Design a protein around this nucleic acid. Structure first.
Ligand SMILES: Nc1nc2c(ncn2[C@@H]2O[C@H](COP(=O)(O)OP(=O)(O)O)[C@@H](O)[C@H]2O)c(=O)[nH]1
Ligand SMILES: Nc1nc2c(ncn2[C@@H]2O[C@H](COP(=O)(O)OP(=O)(O)O)[C@@H](O)[C@H]2O)c(=O)[nH]1
Ligand SMILES: [K+]
Ligand SMILES: [Mg+2]
Ligand SMILES: [Mg+2]
Ligand SMILES: [Mg+2]
Ligand SMILES: [Zn+2]
Lengths: 136, 299, 99, 131, 244, 230, 337
RNA sequence: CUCUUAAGGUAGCCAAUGGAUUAACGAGAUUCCCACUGUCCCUAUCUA
């Protein structure tokens, strides 16, 4: 489930394969994040690594501060547009795919998160829940 | 600073390293080639043999070279300690021998791949590959003594205590058999031996404690004799270098009952002789074994 | 050294309040809290903790704690009562109301 | 299902909602903030010439004027007249939080409504003057 | 009266727990070790309640309250609300709040008398806070940092703010809250102090990674032990100079 | 732990209670285990085991001989002690090498219809100031990787081998064509620079060029070995 | 030996060079500590503020693009060694705008060490892109090392053709024992070797293009009955002091395959004069590279769908113009003595 | 007998311009970007 995550993770429908671009939901100055790798991904021929809500990816900043650009950093997905099933009894989805920039220990670079944050991601990552103002 | 050098991989000797690399080549590369195959296939087979063996030797040498500390680039206290323990000249010479052997192996591999590009028969390609491997083996066999020295040095240096030269430090010094190790046992949880004969402690020992929510390290040193530096030996040089380098609070221990085997005049003389060592450091003189004789009832 | 001055001052200073109103804000400590006896891990007569109950029953990951045992209800027989939720397509919770 | 509806109303191509636009138009301060925006290079017209009703940026003042002289803007204005259909409307239609919905409708009629209408009239005359 | 523990090898105590003067809330995940760690210090004097908020374990981040009231977000289910009501005595009011900022623990930093709130909460939410918690309400940031409930730890005795708070802001917030405030870190260099620890007028709980100088500063500012006021800063100045 | 903590632990706590007996029994089983390894190991491991056993036996016999010999019981100056180190050629006849083995046919053209270029497959010496001829006129090809400049020359007197530069190819025994092409095969007479050997004639002239004969196959072993003709 | 130095059988017990006295020892240790602290501060200025801090956040710099490794392939360098081995005269072609930048010093050292009989000269091409005095100063400075000829390559309107031809005739007469001589043209890509050969022949015999790697194999051109010319692919010697920005600005890589040219645009700003840039692009009023790109895009109509300016496309066009000579610029020659 | 390093401070003299770095056109050959998408992840369904 990755280093820094709080416990095990149940399966969520994958919406972001490698090569996807998502928004940046923190206040570190990055505008978008380009997914190049998914942490904890398995191995199968011809299959692209994909990430869901609450996953950690390796991303490069495409738009934002030039100091943040041209570097690879860990990110945590906090919103996805692909619908997924909650065990309470509903399928649901967000407007956009959005992630936040973090460290290998799962600590946010920014100080706050704009927009809603998924319940699964907030429960899996304590620092995301600490920096979230809206949790679903 | 790194402060600890235990994570150095095992250094095999010359014959064992040769066996490891050559048998890895024989196992991990294909071994069946036929004289009826194409000359391009035969040449590629023997080129792969030479290149893989060269890469194995080079990666072993690089694992040796990266692991060991740089004696000149570390803090001067650690540099002096490792010079006293392992003879910095021999240290650098052995590591330079390893580096030169790596360069020679790379050159042999490149030259013999280039020569194997022009092989005309399986016999000739086999001879060129055997020549390349034999030259690599001669280069490795020339490293018999530095590899053994480096393995011994690695085993010793992995067990050295970690000393931070910039933290809060209490040095303990004096003559043998005065109670330095006993005081270290009293104030810390170090397992230094306490025995009633001189030089039970042959190396620096470290303990730790907490005072006012701050971590302090206490250093027990081997005994120092009242001798000039020209006839001073390495065991005493450890203590001398520790006192000279570690900006700290030095505690000079004195025995007034002379059960340590040294007179009070000799202890005072040793204190005045090591007086130039503690400049711009805190100094305190601790009179031990007061349960035997007190400073008040002295002559 | 003058470099470690401003940061040291800003981290050593303790801000103090000053009046702003004549309203008394006193710390609250319950009488049971201040009469509570200190817990001793090595004591023959100590309180039986929840982890002790868990260890004696099933251990961690096997013991099923009854969350209704701590309910402060008018009748103690009402603790293990199943509260109805759905009746004929209506939620009972938004009809539940005194008087 | 069909290609036209899919490629118009895909999730990633969603537009701002009527209740949010109504809340934006209700207060004069929000109207002033949307009229005076910082110069953004990622928006058409440097973030200027923004129609609040349609939530749409224009590249030029003439483009904004032609948009105002159009049936699409009139359709949006006609849509933004009544109650913005929050969740309370559907709840009260089902028979849930009826008093809350009635109080919300009364507050919209009494306080929010006329102030929003006056703000819309002020925005209209300001656009007419500046255009 | 400052202890160290972890919730499943995590130092973020304030994320998974809520502590007031009259009750304690703990997450239901896993074993009973976290509950027993709170119970060793609290006894049976105040109720300690296993609870979930919207099926999650982040109850200190999702909820906020003091000795008189407890506010839960709109995602709290009727069953969770009923469980909280059945577990707690009548002297603690319980309210479900229709607020866009559902992370009440992040957006509200309160004690028994004062409250700092996010500058963008609803007016009805502010009035509900004043009615239920019975406290004065101020819209504030901790030196430009929103989420005051996660970046400040507050009790009736003192307060701990994140170390990037300026001296002028510390003075202004101390005047607003009528308690002494100090800037410091918890959990060995973490700046999220409110999510790092829980505290009341007689108990503080931090993570295992919290160092001795940090614990000493926490005890000094929250006045936990009998001989630990807020004026021992002069005595701990040498230790703090060495640490910083 | 610090310094010799395992030795200190042995000194302060001892070892396991069955350590001595277990070690003694393992060393007693060692003979059976050696025999079973010799009879059971197959292939490369078995060959290596037999080779190592032979080497150990030779070493043991030499040690026994040295002990028995011990129990039974150049006229250099002062500054040199305590310091250590017919006109027939040595190879009058070598293996003949045909032109088919010596040259490799190189084909040119889009359909590879032309076959006039020949590449020399042996090692060559091209001398100083060598520039390749233009490719349109280059019939004989001597690739650069096969060009040699130095050789390991062994002096019969004093028994030393020195890496010396090559001066000329005097005689290739196969053909004068190969001699003038500079082919370096076995039995070839070459001229080498002997400046570092410090040879002086009877008249006081310093010798810096002599003749040597190639004694190996450089196309086989990648290097040129020669014996100085003295 | 090592065995006596350290180990079970060690016999060393005292330092080899014992200290004279404790005062000298403490003075030496204090000096060593001071030097160590000064060195630590000197490396904390750059390396610790750089590489060391990045691993704390887990950040890693992006992989270096392979488009910057062009000119360093084994096939190209085999071709280079082939043309050198076949050449009697070697002409090193330099760009008049950056002659020290476009020099193959390692190749020159190899030629002067291993092939001293091959004659190496300098041709300073594209002298029409620099002022007259700049070209004269560069010729004077480079003549202190090697015979340097100023040149401007063109089939119709060229400069230096007769001088190069008479110098080659001098070389041919010097090597009169040889039936012919070969002159191989080496240097950086896009310096104009094929253009110089076409200028000498007064005919387009070698392919010429601004794109790097237009010439991929060697080519023989008969200039006279006794003179052959060898066109060679461009080479970029590997180095550590030369960065990706320098490699890009030496006209070495294809701009279409770089990731972010907007970060290289400040290099254009630092290398070009403000007056020259504003005359070329008919714009002004910028305060940084982003403003320059935005103003140029809005003036030229390079807008993406939705009004966004095309930063990457404008940056690529600017870099192409800089490399291909639609913007005037040069590197100052060394000062006169 | 002799030959080449005199040119100098971001655009010169010398004869609008100093040009083939040639507009336009092209089922000519090549590279890249936006948009777009079942090319792909990863395949499913419908009609003749
Ligand atoms: N009576 C007495 N004996 C001591 C005291 N300290 C040390 N000793 C004795 O001194 C002997 C050796 O002391 P030791 O700790 O090895 O001193 P060191 O050689 O400087 O490390 C031990 O056998 C102890 O019994 C003390 O305070 N009182
Ligand atoms: N202004 C100017 N441009 C030149 C000159 N020589 C070459 N060029 C240009 O440089 C570009 C690349 O030249 P090219 O001969 O292909 O470089 P190569 O890689 O060395 O062969 C061509 O488009 C030419 O127009 C010169 O003397 N002056
Ligand atoms: K080119
Ligand atoms: Mg595949
Ligand atoms: Mg001792
Ligand atoms: Mg070319
Ligand atoms: Zn409109």
């Amino acid at each position: 489930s990755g280093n820094g995550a709080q416990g095990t993770k149940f399966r969520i429908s994958l919406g972001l394969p490698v090569g996807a671009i998502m928004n940046c939901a923190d206040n570190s100055g990055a505008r978008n994040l380009y997914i190049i790798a998914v942490k904890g991904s398995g191995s199968r021929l011809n299959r692209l690594p994909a990430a869901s809500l609450g996953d950690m990816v390796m991303a490069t900043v495409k738009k934002g501060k030039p100091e943040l650009r041209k570097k690879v950093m860990p990110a945590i997905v906090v919103r996805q547009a692909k619908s997924w099933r909650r065990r309470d009894g509903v399928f649901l989805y967000f407007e956009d795919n959005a992630g936040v920039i973090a460290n290998p220990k799962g600590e946010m670079k920014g100080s706050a998160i704009t927009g809603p944050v998924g319940k699964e991601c907030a429960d899996l990552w304590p620092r995301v829940a600490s920096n979230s103002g809206v949790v679903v | 600073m790194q402060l600890s050098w235990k994570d150095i991989p095992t250094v095999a000797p010359a014959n064992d390293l040769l066996d490891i690399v050559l048998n890895r080549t024989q196992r991990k590369t294909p071994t069946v080639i036929r004289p009826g195959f194409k000359i391009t296939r035969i040449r590629a087979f023997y080129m792969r043999k030479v290149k893989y063996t060269g890469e194995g030797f080079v990666e072993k040498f690089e694992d040796i070279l990266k692991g060991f500390p740089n004696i000149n680039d570390v803090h001067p206290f650690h540099r002096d300690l490792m010079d006293t323990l392992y003879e910095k000249n021999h240290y650098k010479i052995s590591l330079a021998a390893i580096s030169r052997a790596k360069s020679l192996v790379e050159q042999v591999a490149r030259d013999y791949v280039r020569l194997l590009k022009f092989g005309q028969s399986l016999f000739q390609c086999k001879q060129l590959k055997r020549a390349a491997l034999g030259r690599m083996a001669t280069i490795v066999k020339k490293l018999r003594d530095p590899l053994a020295y480096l393995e011994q040095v690695r085993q010793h240096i992995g067990r050295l205590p970690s000393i931070d030269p910039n933290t809060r430090t209490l040095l303990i010094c004096g003559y043998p058999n005065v109670g330095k190790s006993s005081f270290l046992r009293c104030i810390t949880k170090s397992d230094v031996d306490v025995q009633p004969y001189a030089f039970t402690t042959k190396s620096l020992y470290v303990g730790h404690f907490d005072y006012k929510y701050l971590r302090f390290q206490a250093i027990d040193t081997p005994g120092i004799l009242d001798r000039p530096t020209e006839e001073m030996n390495n065991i005493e040089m450890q203590s001398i270098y520790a006192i000279a380098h570690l900006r700290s609070c030095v505690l000079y221990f004195m025995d007034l009952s002379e059960q340590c085997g040294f007179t009070i005049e000799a202890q005072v003389k040793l204190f005045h002789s090591i007086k130039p060592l503690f400049a711009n450091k805190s100094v305190m003189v601790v009179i031990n074994k007061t349960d035997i004789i007190r400073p008040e009832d002295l002559d | 050294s003058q470099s470690r001055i401003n940061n040291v001052l800003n981290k050593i200073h303790v801000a103090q309040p000053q009046a702003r109103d004549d309203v008394k804000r006193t710390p609250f400590i319950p009488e049971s809290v201040k009469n509570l006896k200190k817990y001793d891990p090595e004591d023959p007569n100590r309180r039986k903790l929840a982890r002790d109950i868990e260890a004696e029953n099933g251990g961690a990951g096997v013991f099923n704690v009854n969350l209704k045992d701590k309910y402060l209800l008018e009748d103690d027989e009402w603790k293990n009562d199943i509260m109805p939720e759905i009746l004929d397509g209506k939620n009972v919770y938004d009809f539940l109301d005194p008087e | 299902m069909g290609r036209y509806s899919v490629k118009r109303y895909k999730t990633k191509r969603r537009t701002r909602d009527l209740d949010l636009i109504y809340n934006d138009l209700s207060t004069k301060e929000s109207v002033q903030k949307l009229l005076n925006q910082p110069l953004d290079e990622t928006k058409p017209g440097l973030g200027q010439h923004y129609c609040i009703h349609c939530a749409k940026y224009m590249e030029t003042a003439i483009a904004l004027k032609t948009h105002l002289k159009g049936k699409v803007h009139k359709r949006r204005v006609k849509e933004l007249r009544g109650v913005p259909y929050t969740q309370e409307v559907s709840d009260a239609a089902a028979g849930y939080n009826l008093n809350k919905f009635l109080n919300r409708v009364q507050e919209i009629t009494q306080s929010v409504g006329p102030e929003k209408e006056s703000n819309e009239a002020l925005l209209k005359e300001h656009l007419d003057s500046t255009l | 009266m400052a202890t160290r523990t972890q919730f499943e090898n995590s130092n973020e105590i304030g994320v998974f727990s809520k502590l007031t003067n009259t009750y304690c809330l703990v997450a239901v995940g896993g074993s009973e070790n976290f509950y027993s760690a709170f119970e060793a210090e609290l006894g049976d004097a105040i109720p300690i309640v296993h609870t979930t908020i919207a099926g999650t374990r982040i109850i200190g981040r999702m909820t906020a309250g003091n000795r008189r009231g407890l506010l839960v977000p709109t995602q709290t289910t009727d069953q969770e609300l009923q469980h909280l009501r059945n577990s707690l005595p009548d002297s603690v009011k319980i309210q479900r709040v229709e607020e866009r900022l559902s992370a009440l623990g992040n957006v509200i930093c309160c004690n028994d008398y004062v409250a700092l709130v996010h500058p963008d909460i609803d007016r009805e939410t502010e009035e509900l806070i004043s009615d239920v918690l019975g406290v004065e309400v101020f819209r504030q940031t901790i030196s430009g940092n929103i989420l005051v409930g996660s970046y400040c730890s507050l009790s009736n005795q003192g307060g701990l703010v994140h170390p990037q708070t300026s001296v002028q802001d510390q003075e202004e917030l101390s005047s607003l809250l009528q308690v002494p405030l100090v800037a410091g870190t918890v959990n060995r260099g973490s700046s999220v102090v409110g999510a790092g620890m829980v505290v009341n007028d007689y108990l503080a709980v931090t993570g295992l990674d919290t160092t001795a100088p940090e614990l000493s500063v926490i005890e000094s500012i929250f006045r936990l032990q009998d001989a630990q006021p807020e004026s021992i800063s002069g005595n701990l100045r040498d230790t703090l100079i060495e640490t910083y | 732990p610090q310094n010799d903590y395992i030795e200190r632990h042995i000194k302060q706590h001892g070892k396991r209670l069955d350590h001595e007996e277990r070690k003694r029994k393992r060393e007693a089983r060692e003979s059976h285990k050696i025999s079973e390894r010799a009879q059971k190991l197959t292939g490369w491991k078995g060959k290596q085991f037999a080779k190592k056993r032979y080497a150990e036996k030779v070493s043991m016999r030499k040690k026994i001989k040295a002990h028995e010999q011990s129990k039974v019981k150049d006229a250099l100056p002062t500054y040199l002690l305590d310091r250590e180190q017919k006109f027939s050629v040595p190879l009058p006849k070598v293996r003949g090498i045909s032109e088919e083995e010596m040259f490799k046919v190189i084909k040119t053209g889009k359909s590879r219809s032309k076959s006039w270029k020949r590449m020399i497959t042996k090692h060559t010496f091209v001398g100083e100031g060598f520039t390749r001829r233009p490719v349109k006129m280059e019939r004989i090809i001597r690739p650069s990787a096969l060009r040699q400049k130095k050789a390991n020359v062994t002096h019969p007197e004093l028994g030393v081998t020195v890496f010396l530069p090559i001066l000329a190819v005097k005689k290739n025994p196969q053909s004068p064509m190969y001699t003038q092409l500079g082919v370096l095969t076995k039995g070839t007479i070459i001229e080498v620079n002997v400046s570092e050997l410090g040879m002086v004639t009877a008249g006081g002239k310093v010798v810096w060029g002599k003749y040597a004969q190639v004694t190996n196959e450089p196309d086989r072993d990648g290097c040129v070995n020669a014996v100085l003709l003295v | 030996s090592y065995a006596d130095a350290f180990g079970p059988k060690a016999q060393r017990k005292r330092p080899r060079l014992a200290a004279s006295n404790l005062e000298d020892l403490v003075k030496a240790t204090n000096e060593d500590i001071t030097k160590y602290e000064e060195k630590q501060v000197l490396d904390a200025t750059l390396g610790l503020m750089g590489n060391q801090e990045d691993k704390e956040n887990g950040w890693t710099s992006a992989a270096k693009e392979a488009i910057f490794s062009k000119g360093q392939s084994k096939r190209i360098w085999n071709e280079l060694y082939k043309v050198i081995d076949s050449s009697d005269v070697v002409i090193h072609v330099l760009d008049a705008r950056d002659p020290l930048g476009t020099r193959c010093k390692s190749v020159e050292e190899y030629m002067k060490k291993e092939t001293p009989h091959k004659h190496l000269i300098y041709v300073l091409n594209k002298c029409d892109l620099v002022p007259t005095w700049v070209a004269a100063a560069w010729v004077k400075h480079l003549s202190k090392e090697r015979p340097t000829l100023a040149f401007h390559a063109s089939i119709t309107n060229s400069f230096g053709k007769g001088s190069l031809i008479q110098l080659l005739r001098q070389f041919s007469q010097l090597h009169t024992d040889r039936k012919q001589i070969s002159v191989g043209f080496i240097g950086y890509p896009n310096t104009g070797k094929s253009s110089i050969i076409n200028t000498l022949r007064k005919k387009k015999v070698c392919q010429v293009a601004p794109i790097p790697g237009e010439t991929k194999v060697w080519q023989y051109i008969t200039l006279m009955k006794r003179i052959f010319l060898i066109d060679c692919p461009g080479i970029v010697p590997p180095s550590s002091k030369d960065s990706e920005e320098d490699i890009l600005f030496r006209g070495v890589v294809r701009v279409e395959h770089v990731t972010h040219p907007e970060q290289y645009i400040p290099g254009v700003l630092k290398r070009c004069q403000v007056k020259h840039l504003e005359r070329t692009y008919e714009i002004s009023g910028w305060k940084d590279a982003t403003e320059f790109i935005e103003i140029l895009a809005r003036k030229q109509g390079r807008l993406l769908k939705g009004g966004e300016p095309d930063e990457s496309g404008v940056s690529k066009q600017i870099l192409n113009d800089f490399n291909r000579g639609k913007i005037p610029w040069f590197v100052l020659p060394p000062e006169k003595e």
